[PDB]
Design an enzyme around this catalytic site. Structure first.
Site, PDB file in Angstrom:
ATOM      1  N   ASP A 143       0.870  -1.170  -0.075  1.00  0.00           N
ATOM      2  CA  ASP A 143       0.171   0.171   0.109  1.00  0.00           C
ATOM      3  C   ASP A 143       0.862   1.165  -0.024  1.00  0.00           C
ATOM      4  O   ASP A 143       1.121   1.562   1.460  1.00  0.00           O
ATOM      5  CB  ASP A 143      -0.803   0.015   1.169  1.00  0.00           C
ATOM      6  CG  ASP A 143      -1.833   1.077   0.998  1.00  0.00           C
ATOM      7  OD1 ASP A 143      -2.009   1.843   0.009  1.00  0.00           O
ATOM      8  OD2 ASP A 143      -2.274   1.577   2.157  1.00  0.00           O
ATOM      9  N   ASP A 145      -1.600   5.470  -5.799  1.00  0.00           N
ATOM     10  CA  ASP A 145      -1.858   4.786  -4.670  1.00  0.00           C
ATOM     11  C   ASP A 145      -2.162   3.360  -4.940  1.00  0.00           C
ATOM     12  O   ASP A 145      -3.248   2.781  -5.258  1.00  0.00           O
ATOM     13  CB  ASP A 145      -3.145   5.236  -4.005  1.00  0.00           C
ATOM     14  CG  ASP A 145      -3.662   4.494  -2.813  1.00  0.00           C
ATOM     15  OD1 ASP A 145      -3.114   3.640  -2.243  1.00  0.00           O
ATOM     16  OD2 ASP A 145      -4.762   4.995  -2.176  1.00  0.00           O
TER      17      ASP A 145
HETATM   18  C1  LIG Z   1      -9.816   1.474  -0.714  1.00  0.00           C
HETATM   19  C2  LIG Z   1      -8.568   1.851   0.530  1.00  0.00           C
HETATM   20  O1  LIG Z   1      -9.261   2.415   1.742  1.00  0.00           O
HETATM   21  N1  LIG Z   1      -7.413   1.778   0.325  1.00  0.00           N
HETATM   22  C3  LIG Z   1      -6.488   1.867   1.426  1.00  0.00           C
HETATM   23  C4  LIG Z   1      -5.606   0.677   1.842  1.00  0.00           C
HETATM   24  C5  LIG Z   1      -6.773  -0.525   2.153  1.00  0.00           C
HETATM   25  C6  LIG Z   1      -6.791  -1.716   1.065  1.00  0.00           C
HETATM   26  C7  LIG Z   1      -7.744  -2.621   1.245  1.00  0.00           C
HETATM   27  F1  LIG Z   1      -7.938  -3.515   0.752  1.00  0.00           F
HETATM   28  C8  LIG Z   1      -8.557  -2.296   2.336  1.00  0.00           C
HETATM   29  C9  LIG Z   1      -8.721  -1.238   3.425  1.00  0.00           C
HETATM   30  F2  LIG Z   1      -9.387  -1.059   4.285  1.00  0.00           F
HETATM   31  C10 LIG Z   1      -7.399  -0.296   3.219  1.00  0.00           C
HETATM   32  C11 LIG Z   1      -5.623   3.084   1.004  1.00  0.00           C
HETATM   33  O2  LIG Z   1      -4.398   3.295   2.115  1.00  0.00           O
HETATM   34  C12 LIG Z   1      -6.072   4.507   0.739  1.00  0.00           C
HETATM   35  C13 LIG Z   1      -6.920   4.742   1.966  1.00  0.00           C
HETATM   36  O3  LIG Z   1      -7.519   6.163   1.649  1.00  0.00           O
HETATM   37  C14 LIG Z   1      -6.577   7.296   1.533  1.00  0.00           C
HETATM   38  O4  LIG Z   1      -5.619   7.289   2.694  1.00  0.00           O
HETATM   39  C15 LIG Z   1      -6.105   7.812   3.815  1.00  0.00           C
HETATM   40  C16 LIG Z   1      -5.285   7.653   4.702  1.00  0.00           C
HETATM   41  C17 LIG Z   1      -5.613   8.574   6.120  1.00  0.00           C
HETATM   42  C18 LIG Z   1      -4.573   8.378   7.344  1.00  0.00           C
HETATM   43  C19 LIG Z   1      -4.585   6.881   7.501  1.00  0.00           C
HETATM   44  C20 LIG Z   1      -3.997   6.253   6.381  1.00  0.00           C
HETATM   45  C21 LIG Z   1      -5.012   6.306   5.460  1.00  0.00           C
HETATM   46  C22 LIG Z   1      -5.782   6.987   0.065  1.00  0.00           C
HETATM   47  N2  LIG Z   1      -5.036   5.452   0.337  1.00  0.00           N
END
Ligand SMILES: CC(=O)N[C@@H](Cc1cc(F)cc(F)c1)[C@H](O)[C@H]1CO[C@@H](OCC2CCCCC2)CN1
Length: 393
Positions: free
Chosen positions: A40, A236
């Site tokens: 990620d 991402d």
């Molecule tokens: C789809 C998804 O949620 N992908 C996640 C990873 C992610 C993947 C998955 F399969 C399940 C999940 F719950 C989460 C990704 O991190 C996104 C998360 O949203 C944004 O980041 C927000 C950030 C706020 C502070 C804490 C860390 C995250 C952009 N990146």
């Protein structure tokens, strides 16, 4: 000049798909506990399941690790839909098909979760590769990659080749299939064709970039470039779709509908919720447009473009009848948190996270899905003025 691949031990170390994520095998603890970890670039915490869950076949058992250290602190991470609650600690960590190094890293032992784990994904944890600024509880929790670089001679860079199959994969198919590569500490030249073009990392929190122009089949979306990066644009691997700010999504969908107008699709398809099927082998790729995202170059007043095909933005899905039809979901969706260049975009390219030089490299992927008429592209330079003005404050 023939391009040589110098990181054979890390080539083909990923498995998975855009919809459920790409994962790498890791070990935690002493004796080593093998876990599959989602790669990620959109978060900064390294966390693993550490308690029974219906979607987990294995999890981290801290009581069985002689090298486990309790940080005596809770941790909560909210994602787009998913979230988890955990207990902080440290332990020895290795990547079997990675650099031949063991590091002591922060690990959040997941004790509670909601819509985090994915049934049949085969991963049990997450590897947040972004910067300390977005780590929870705060920026004092050193992310995994920072620990790795600080404790070893591994160069401050990683690159990702995410390989979409172009067709659905069931659980047993992703287990048996190569999903791509995570090259830790370098660039493997066998993973791409043509040139690598670099965009600056605007700020080290997410892997933030600046989009200066958007085209649908060569036609300028003609929006003020600030709109493209409102409130930010990030690369991402942990998000499936290409996510666009509300105004940009609405303009893009109108243009993609206009370009594909020889066939009409239900509203649910354009909303990214409903699948569309065509008879085996008859997907009308040619009716769908190519999409170009222009990115700020490293040279003043210079940009370059990355071009994806519908083979990237149409995500292969299985039919309810598991028929011979080729089915897909529209993998472009609305965002209230900026542009998200998700896995479906990354599948078109070899993406270099050059942290050392604060830049992100893009080159056409050797594993991108295409047809005999069109391919993904990375091209430049283009003379583009006042690109800093595209950045949102
Ligand atoms: C789809 C998804 O949620 N992908 C996640 C990873 C992610 C993947 C998955 F399969 C399940 C999940 F719950 C989460 C990704 O991190 C996104 C998360 O949203 C944004 O980041 C927000 C950030 C706020 C502070 C804490 C860390 C995250 C952009 N990146």
């Amino acid at each position: 000049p023939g391009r040589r691949g110098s990181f054979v031990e890390m080539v083909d170390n990923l498995r998975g798909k855009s919809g459920q994520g790409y994962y790498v095998e890791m070990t935690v603890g002493s004796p080593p506990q093998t876990l599959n970890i989602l790669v990620d670039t959109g978060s900064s915490n390294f966390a693993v399941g550490a308690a029974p869950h219906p979607f987990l076949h294995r999890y981290y058992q801290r009581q069985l690790s002689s090298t486990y250290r309790d940080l005596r602190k809770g941790v909560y991470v909210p994602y787009t839909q998913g979230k988890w609650e955990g207990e902080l600690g440290t332990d020895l960590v290795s990547i079997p098909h990675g650099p031949n190094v063991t590091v002591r890293a922060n690990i959040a032992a997941i004790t509670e979760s909601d819509k985090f784990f994915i049934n049949g994904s085969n991963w049990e944890g997450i590897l947040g590769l972004a910067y300390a600024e977005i780590a929870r509880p705060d920026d004092s929790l050193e992310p995994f990659f920072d620990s790795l670089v600080k404790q070893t001679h591994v160069p401050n860079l990683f690159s990702l080749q995410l390989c979409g199959a172009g067709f659905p994969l069931n659980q047993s198919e992703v287990l048996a299939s190569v999903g791509g590569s995570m090259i830790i500490g370098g660039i493997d030249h066998s993973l791409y064709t043509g040139s690598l073009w670099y965009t600056p990392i605007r700020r080290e929190w997410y892997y933030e970039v600046i989009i200066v122009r958007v085209e649908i089949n060569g036609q300028d979306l003609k929006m003020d470039c600030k709109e493209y990066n409102y409130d930010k644009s990030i690369v991402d691997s942990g998000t499936t779709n290409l996510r666009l700010p509300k105004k940009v999504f609405e303009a893009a969908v109108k243009s993609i509908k206009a370009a594909s107008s020889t066939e009409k699709f239900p509203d649910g398809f354009w909303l990214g919720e409903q699948l569309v099927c065509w008879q085996a082998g008859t997907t009308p790729w040619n009716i769908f447009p190519v999409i170009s995202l222009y990115l700020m170059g490293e040279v003043t007043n210079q940009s370059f473009r990355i071009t994806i095909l519908p083979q990237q933005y149409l995500r292969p899905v299985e039919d309810v009848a598991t028929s011979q039809d080729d089915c897909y979901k529209f993998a472009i969706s609305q965002s209230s948190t900026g542009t998200v260049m998700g896995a479906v975009i990354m599948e078109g390219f070899y993406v270099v996270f050059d942290r050392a030089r604060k830049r992100i490299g893009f080159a056409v992927s050797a594993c991108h899905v295409h047809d005999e008429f069109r391919t993904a592209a990375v091209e430049g330079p283009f003379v583009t003025l006042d690109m800093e003005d595209c950045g949102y404050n």
